[PDB]
Design a protein around this ligand. Structure first.
Ligand SMILES: Nc1ncnc2c1ncn2[C@@H]1O[C@H](COP(=O)(O)OP(=O)(O)OP(=O)(O)O)[C@@H](O)[C@H]1O
Ligand SMILES: Nc1ncnc2c1ncn2[C@@H]1O[C@H](COP(=O)(O)OP(=O)(O)OP(=O)(O)O)[C@@H](O)[C@H]1O
Ligand SMILES: [Mg+2]
Lengths: 253, 257
């Protein structure tokens, strides 16, 4: 399709998610999840909205003040932002852990190989996790002692509500990127970024540098003031107004 | 999936659509599409709202008054409501036609076999459609000559706008099941049922049996007063008020909506 196609990027990223499945990284359930992401993205406007920028500033602040920052990676992340998830882990000095709900050997390997394609030297935790998140079935709650297990601040993007929830109960401060503000994961996380992860990861990286040197007292003012409930509400309000406008345009009969 | 799970029904149908692709009936793109429907189902509340019940009564009435109704069947319909689609067709005296966006012989065959598991002798059209619906991709515009090609009323659920619109330009009265009330398909169709096909179909089969005796008079009064445009806006209003309410009440850490 021509570069001017209004569906240009979502189409571009869709092939990417399919290539993901082809590479054995992205699970079938992943394609379904991607579609949900697409629809929601169409609704918010395929751009980072103010409530998302707001939550991202707060999440970055929180990661810089963190003690053991950990960025989680699953099959979709690997298909969409392999390079950006690494850059983000460095800009935040957080470690990288592959963490799958539907964990298999090939999938962990392929995702591992995919990340390396961009940095053959990054430490990738999660190849053989020993620990478990309490409240989850064994095979779905694995976590590596050096990563999530010891983490205080965690970023689990595109995550399932059971895991997000078990993580909060476990005492971890949870940050996620999720285009569905109505999902359990989005509603349970401590900081929810409602934005397409292809836009949020590079943005959080930019915000990383822009905040690189901030008075710890400032980084603390930022997070201390952030209101995830207010954020969710504004996102729901954003979507509604969008629905009012969208319904007023396009082909009809 | 334990039935006690808060998201049992959501997960159940995700498994079904996945087992559909594996059984060769459902395409990969169909998995994404199922996901798109889910996004809209969330906005609606994952239930049958009034404006859906309304559109469905009209559709059934229209199908009962038709003389050459046809019900389409794609990979998603085949994996999610194989039995209800057959029930509905027979409760509406409509013919069944297999229609896919990504057509192949293995896919047509498997969708064919799945329907049989519910009726070993059910008639199935679209096996090798030969009529080219003009103004479309040859690859995705061929219909069955004894099916859609001569139908007066057609039901094409989870349809792409290009097909839904082309059929309208074909002079076919079109009914559809589409969770996105803003979709081109939802806008070009004569009667749009904004509801999940796993809820709408069995609900429509109910109506086709409870309406089988409605007088021509009553049925014509229904199809006659129906207003797709008003029904779509009614759907958007439901959603916008739900969003307003949730926003005001707040949803962070909220378990139940
Ligand atoms: N490309 C993407 N960018 C951002 N977010 C995404 C993307 N793809 C999927 N998501 C989000 O991740 C979720 C997909 O995972 P999952 O299937 O667990 O969702 P869900 O089950 O509906 O939510 P929950 O598990 O909280 O009930 C979706 O809710 C969607 O909002
Ligand atoms: N399980 C389901 N139940 C009800 N409706 C569904 C389901 N899955 C998908 N749909 C609807 O069918 C459509 C699938 O087709 P597709 O997504 O290709 O069309 P679209 O490009 O999103 O919209 P359009 O092509 O009409 O502009 C979706 O718009 C969705 O609203
Ligand atoms: Mg889930």
């Amino acid at each position: 399709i021509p570069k001017s196609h209004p569906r240009y990027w979502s189409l571009y990223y869709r092939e990417k998610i399919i290539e993901g499945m082809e590479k054995g990284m992205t699970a079938k359930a992943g394609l379904i999840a991607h579609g949900r992401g697409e629809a929601f993205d169409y609704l918010i406007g395929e751009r980072t909205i103010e409530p998302a920028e707001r939550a991202m500033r707060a999440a970055v602040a929180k990661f810089l003040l963190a003690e053991h920052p950990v960025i989680s990676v699953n099959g979709n992340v690997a298909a969409l932002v392999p390079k950006e998830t690494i850059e983000l882990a460095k800009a935040l000095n957080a470690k990288l852990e592959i963490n799958l709900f539907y964990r298999t050997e090939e999938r962990v390997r392929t995702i591992a190989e995919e990340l390396r394609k961009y940095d053959p030297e990054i430490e990738i935790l999660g190849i053989n996790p020993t620990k478990r998140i309490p409240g989850l079935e064994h095979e779905r709650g694995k976590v590596d002692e050096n990563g999530i297990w010891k983490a205080d601040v965690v970023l689990v993007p595109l995550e399932d509500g059971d895991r997000t929830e078990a993580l909060v109960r476990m005492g971890k401060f949870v940050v996620t990127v999720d285009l569905n503000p109505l999902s359990r994961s989005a509603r349970m996380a401590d900081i929810t970024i409602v934005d397409n992860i292809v836009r949020a990861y590079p943005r959080m990286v930019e915000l990383a540098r822009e905040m690189k040197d901030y008075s710890r007292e400032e980084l603390l003012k930022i997070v201390g003031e952030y209101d995830n409930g207010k954020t969710l509400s504004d996102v729901l309000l954003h979507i509604r107004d969008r629905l009012t406008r969208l319904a007023e345009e396009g082909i009809w009969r």
